[PDB]
Amino acid sequence: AREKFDRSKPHVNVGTIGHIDHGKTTLTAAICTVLAKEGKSAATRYDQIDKAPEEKARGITINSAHVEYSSDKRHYAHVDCPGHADYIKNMITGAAQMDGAILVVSATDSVMPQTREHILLARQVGVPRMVVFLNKCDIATDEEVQELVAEEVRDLLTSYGFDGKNTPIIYGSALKALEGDPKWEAKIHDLMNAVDEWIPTPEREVDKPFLLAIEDTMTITGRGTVVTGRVERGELKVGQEIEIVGLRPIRKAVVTGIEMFKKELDSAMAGDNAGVLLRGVDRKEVERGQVLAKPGSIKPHKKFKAEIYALKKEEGGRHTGFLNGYRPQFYFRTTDVTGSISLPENTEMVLPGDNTSITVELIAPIACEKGSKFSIREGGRTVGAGSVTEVLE
Amino acid sequence: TNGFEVLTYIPGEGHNLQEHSVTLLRGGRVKDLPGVRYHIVRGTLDTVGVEKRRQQRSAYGAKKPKA
Amino acid sequence: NIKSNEKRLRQNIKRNLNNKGQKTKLKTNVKNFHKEINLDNLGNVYSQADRLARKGIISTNRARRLKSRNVAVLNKT
Amino acid sequence: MKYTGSIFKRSRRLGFSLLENNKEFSKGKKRKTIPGQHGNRFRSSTMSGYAQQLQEKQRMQYMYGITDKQFRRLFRLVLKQRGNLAVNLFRVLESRLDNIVYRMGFAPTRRSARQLVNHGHVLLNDRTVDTPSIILNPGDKVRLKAKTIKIPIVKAASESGVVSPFVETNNKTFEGTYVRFPERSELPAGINESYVVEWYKRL
Amino acid sequence: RMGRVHYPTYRIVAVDSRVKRDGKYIALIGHLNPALKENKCKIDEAVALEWLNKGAKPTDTVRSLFSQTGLWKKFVESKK
RNA sequence: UCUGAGAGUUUGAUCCUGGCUCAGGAUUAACGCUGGCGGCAUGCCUAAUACAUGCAAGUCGAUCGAAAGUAGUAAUACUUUAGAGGCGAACGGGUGAGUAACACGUAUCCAAUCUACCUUAUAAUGGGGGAUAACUAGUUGAAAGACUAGCUAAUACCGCAUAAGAACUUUGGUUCGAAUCAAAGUUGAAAGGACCUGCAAGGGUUCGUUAUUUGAUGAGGGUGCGCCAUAUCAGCUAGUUGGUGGGGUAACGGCCUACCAAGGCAAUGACGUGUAGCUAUGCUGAGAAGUAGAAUAGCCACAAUGGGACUGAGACACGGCCCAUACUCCUACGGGAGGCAGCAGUAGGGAAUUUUUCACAAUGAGCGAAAGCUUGAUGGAGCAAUGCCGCGUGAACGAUGAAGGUCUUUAAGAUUGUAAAGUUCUUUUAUUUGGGAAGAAUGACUUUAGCAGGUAAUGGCUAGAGUUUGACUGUACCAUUUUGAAUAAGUGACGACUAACUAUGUGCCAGCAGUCGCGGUAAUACAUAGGUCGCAAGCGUUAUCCGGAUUUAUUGGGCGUAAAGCAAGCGCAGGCGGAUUGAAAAGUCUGGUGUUAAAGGCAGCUGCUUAACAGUUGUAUGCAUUGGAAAC
RNA sequence: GGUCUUGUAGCUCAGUCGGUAGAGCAACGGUCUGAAGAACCGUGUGUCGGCAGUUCGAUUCUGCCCGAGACCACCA
């Protein structure tokens, strides 16, 4: 057996906000560290953040890391999404497909503009009732400062409208959690006890045909190419007739393997992180930003009409508004598409506010799903985020 | 893919050619120019059809058109 | 691999050590006769190579070949 | 190709009737001008041996509907035996199913006949069909199927289709037979053998 | 098997019971298509005993028609 | 009796030589372009490149020690073999890198060859002994592994005996580089099991064993033969040629050793060169032949490279072992692993090449008494318009003719076009519902009866039963089985060559562009629009093998003017020979003998609703022989 | 997925401590021409790749992206 990964609890695609290396990455490590001590499907991590050349020593990561960490209470698709120069694309577009979001804040390393962008977008796509954990409490003097930092992080969340004082700030030291003190174990345990409450596990029905945000690809030794991503809807099953959708022409294909992070799945239901070896494909054929689907389904598109309310500059817009020759990037779950600009009538520039009904074509045929709360940024600043409205070519 | 370089015919009205790009050759003799022997296809590996060859669709890359 | 070329070696290595010892015990007899050209060593090597020509350790073909060539020599008298 | 879709068009060009004459008689002054956008007054000046053999092939097959490779393999099948096999092959051609159905007084239409055979509503010697390409012997029995032996369409078709004297049918039973080897006189005196028979050695 | 798939066929042949079929064979003995097992046998049955008198071992398949030859009832004279 | 079509293409125009093109099929085909089915078949040109995984050869306690364990109170029963020991491991699949050869094939001999295992024929299975793997202890290091010792089995090792026979020496006798035989000497077999029987004694069955001795089989060799280009390749050759003495093979061989002689080969072509698996065969032609040796079959090779060696019946062995190694990989740094040309699968490459697919049902291979078990052999299933076959995309009625393209530009008239609409109908398939395959009528297995020496039956021979074997399948196949015209044409070309024209634009540009050739501003050669004409789930592109090309001419060509008779002559060899005689009788042909595979051809048919095909029956070539001949 | 590099007139390219659109050919009136060359000037076009501040300004400074040109991440 390939340690076929068992599902004995509804899976949730979670993610994390704040900024890496503040204890964020070390939280991703330590929560697992304490896990295999007292948890099933819950292995221990110390330094397994990484699987790539050149990525080890730098301490600031380019790529995101999809892993599986469970408990007796919840399994998590835990994704180490970097927020970094040229790398915040890793975290930004992640906020959509992470069905949950744990805010990691450091008792050593202050909230960054990274955390601000993260919370901004998390509200913009729309996810309610976050939880936050104070990381890196390994240095003393946290009894009362954890009150002022608490009020300022609640101020931080209240810039967009999640739960406020109803969400709790669990304190804890990832260092004294990675090391293994039981009183300090209790810190991550209170983290958990306040996570599973005020965070649900989204049950996505397994009957919709299929859709997958593609995250990475590998062409494994001697069998061929495996492609990993997050299942959006429905199951993926035997030899399944599939078509790679989005950004490209349409390809039908038949599978040749499946895992959840090198751990096989007996049924890749909706919401699963599926890595499928295919019948005769290549990694070069599949990039970040692509989609998949069981056919008879959404097809690629370029043109559309978009009723959208625009992020003001205070919501992180551009220092100056955007015209029609403008070329923004619309955030379609896996990709940031440079598209045209044809705002609705009665809008030549979309000033702060301005719930517009823009119409835009995209450079590549992308499978468009109505209601997809996709986002828009440019220059490193967010101007649009909302659901799809009118399907065009 | 071998070390041999050859002249060939830009097929028809126009071109979709990018000057250091790869495509496929083609048979056909041209009696308008001497010492020339070869043809090369459009709509292939970089190029994009003979456009509006609305009476012919084979080997152009011009698909079976819609009405 | 296979189950039975590995144990084949495991079994035959010692039997072939035995072959080495035995066939040497007869090559020495060959030498001795090349000095002891007489009916004694003839019968001696006869009896002995009887074991091996019967076996595969000698062939009746090569056994007869050698013994005939040797009895030809001893026919000198 | 399988099905033509329009035959009077073909006559327009060919000036020939799949029937005796009645393919084009009068539809408000029937007018057999060849089809298209290029001829009303323009008379024959482009006929060739090549073109005449073309035309003869057409006339033959345009009445008989024989696609390329099947026609060729019919030719080749009959090639194997020895003799003045021309009339033989022609009879065999007629011993095509749809041909016999048309000539049975039961199919007023070869387009009927072949359609009906490919649906297989005709009950034969120990076996049904869905393929209109079987060959008969002089004296081979044919029967309908109860499914269709009541259809007013069928009852008028069996009432009147093209008939050969060398085939018979008890309409009382609707059951008939390809009775005997017919004669060339019993066959359309229009088509030429020499051309096509010499034409066919191409492979 | 020979013949088109969904219609196997097997000519009946004398070949070594060690080297491949369609290899070199001893002799061919008629043919019975294994599709219908009613009868298609057109065997010589002479060269068979010719082989048998100086050593041969058939396959279990042939023991059927060997019973239909009662091959014992004739080769026992040799063993007699 | 077979059986062969030509078109044009050099000018002012003709005739003639010639080429040149065209006009066909063939493909492992690939491209575009789109693409229903059903069947049939096939599916890395590339790198004998790299390669995760599984699979691709195991069997055998009824061969055993021991081990372990179970039930049983125990006694014992019973199980599982890590170990021993035996067979299979040299089958097979891939691959053809490679080689110019005895290779391939053919004829052949092997007075010079071997052939474990059946078959023929029997001589028998007497006496011991020693032994350890295992197991154990301890060493050894992470491992790789290694190392030391305590205890055993066997049909596992050595002698003891006999040895029909057999093998040899030795004298005699046999016969047309040999045998039959008379006589002396030498020398050699195993092992037990089970099962029955019998108190036992002893027998009997049977597993197995030992030898003779057939067969049969292969293997090996030899040879003529015939089996590419290369004379812008002529001297070549030193176990080399010949002889001995010896080694020596399975056996013959300088095959090798020594030793002794110098020899052996050649233009009727060595050597040299490039290429290369072969053969049946595959397509094209009327054929000779070309054409290739897709696929497959049989001979041979090859397993990463280069070496070794056992092993047995067999390797220097494609999933053996060892060596130097390529290079990847592992390690701790001390050491190692590996070799898909087994399967799919991947990577590279390419223009590219199906599933990391199921079945022991059947065939089979093996081993196993017996059950058995395997079996990326085998059968299947699946992708693919890759080929081929069959077959769709409705049947009739139904018009001075719907609209409308399109023209004419006449305002008509037509085309489009029974094609339409509209009706009657139609259901293979789309689509129901179910029935429901054989293949298994094998074969084990237990009985049944009968048979048979043995009688004391076991055990061995014939017939019945059923135990029962399926990936296929559910499908195949069927069910006036539902609904439902519903469920379904693209493609090319239209100057001549050679089928297929109206319009626009446009004017040697754009461009067409197999050939002659169309464009320099009224294009039946550009493009599009319409129409015509072509095929059709295909249609075109391209490639090449050949047809045509008799376009080297044995068939089936010439050499005056379209190259073409070397200046001439002598000129060996060679080629080519007057007549009647004879003999021989090579060829020559005939007659007979066997061989020349399968497959496939060709023809006969059975089954393919018709199919492709598959089978089915024979067919023929030549070789080699026997028998003539007298014609040459 | 970003980056290393490309974006200018008709093509390509220039862009005073930014000042515009500037070079070569296209390009055609007029010369010639057995006919047309080659050959002589004409021409002209210019949002300087697409968006964002910006001085007598963002084409040059930059921010973002797009795509043409190279790399970093299968994978001990």
UniProtKB/Swiss-Prot annotation, chain A:
Region listing for G1, in residue ranges: 18-25
Stretch list, region G5: 173-175
Reaction catalysed by this enzyme: GTP + H2O = GDP + phosphate + H(+)
Chief site of localization: cytoplasm
Listed InterPro entries: EF-Tu_GTP-bd, EF-Tu_GTPase, EFTu-like_2, EFTU_2, G_TR_CS, P-loop_NTPase, Small_GTP-bd, T_Tr_GTP-bd_dom
Pfam families, alphabetized: GTP_EFTU, GTP_EFTU_D2, GTP_EFTU_D3
Region (G3): 80-83
Protein's name according to its UniProt entry: Elongation factor Tu
Subunit structure: Monomer.
Family affiliation: Belongs to the TRAFAC class translation factor GTPase superfamily. Classic translation factor GTPase family. EF-Tu/EF-1A subfamily.
Regions crossing the membrane: none
Swiss-Prot record, chain B:
GO BP terms in the entry: translation
A Gene Ontology cellular-component term: small ribosomal subunit
Keywords, ordered alphabetically: Ribonucleoprotein, Ribosomal protein, RNA-binding, rRNA-binding, tRNA-binding
Coiled-coil portions: none
Transmembrane segments: none
One Gene Ontology MF term: structural constituent of ribosome
Function: With S4 and S5 plays an important role in translational accuracy.
Sequence similarity: Belongs to the universal ribosomal protein uS12 family.
Quaternary structure and partners: Part of the 30S ribosomal subunit. Contacts proteins S8 and S17. May interact with IF1 in the 30S initiation complex.
Entry protein name: Small ribosomal subunit protein uS12
Protein source organism: Mycoplasma pneumoniae (strain ATCC 29342 / M129 / Subtype 1)
Lineage, opening ranks: Bacteria, Bacillati, Mycoplasmatota, Mycoplasmoidales, Mycoplasmoidaceae
Gene assigned in the entry: rpsL
Stretch of the intact protein here: 71 to 137 of 139
From Swiss-Prot, chain C:
Gene3D superfamilies in the cross-refs: Ribosomal protein S20
Keywords: Ribonucleoprotein, Ribosomal protein, RNA-binding, rRNA-binding
InterPro entries: Ribosomal_bS20 (IPR002583), Ribosomal_bS20_sf (IPR036510)
Gene Ontology terms: biological process: translation
GO annotations of cellular component type: ribonucleoprotein complex; ribosome
Free-text function comment from the UniProt entry: Binds directly to 16S ribosomal RNA.
Similarity annotation: Belongs to the bacterial ribosomal protein bS20 family.
UniProt-recorded Gene Ontology molecular function terms: rRNA binding; structural constituent of ribosome
Taxonomic superkingdom: Bacteria
Gene: rpsT
Database matches in NCBIfam families: S20
Pfam families associated with the record: Ribosomal_S20p
Lineage of producing organism: Bacteria, Bacillati, Mycoplasmatota, Mycoplasmoidales, Mycoplasmoidaceae
The name this protein goes by in its record: Small ribosomal subunit protein bS20
Curated annotation (Swiss-Prot), chain D:
Superkingdom in the source lineage: Bacteria
A GO molecular-function descriptor: rRNA binding
CDD domains: S4
GO annotation (BP), single: ribosomal small subunit biogenesis
Domain S4 RNA-binding: 95-156
InterPro entries in the cross-refs: Ribosomal_uS4, Ribosomal_uS4_bac-type, Ribosomal_uS4_CS, Ribosomal_uS4_N, S4_RNA-bd, S4_RNA-bd_sf
An example Gene Ontology CC term for this record: small ribosomal subunit
Protein family (similarity comment): Belongs to the universal ribosomal protein uS4 family.
Function of the molecule: One of the primary rRNA binding proteins, it binds directly to 16S rRNA where it nucleates assembly of the body of the 30S subunit.
Subunit structure as annotated in this protein's UniProt entry: Part of the 30S ribosomal subunit. Contacts protein S5. The interaction surface between S4 and S5 is involved in control of translational fidelity.
Protein name: Small ribosomal subunit protein uS4
Annotated organism of origin: Mycoplasma pneumoniae (strain ATCC 29342 / M129 / Subtype 1) (Mycoplasmoides pneumoniae)
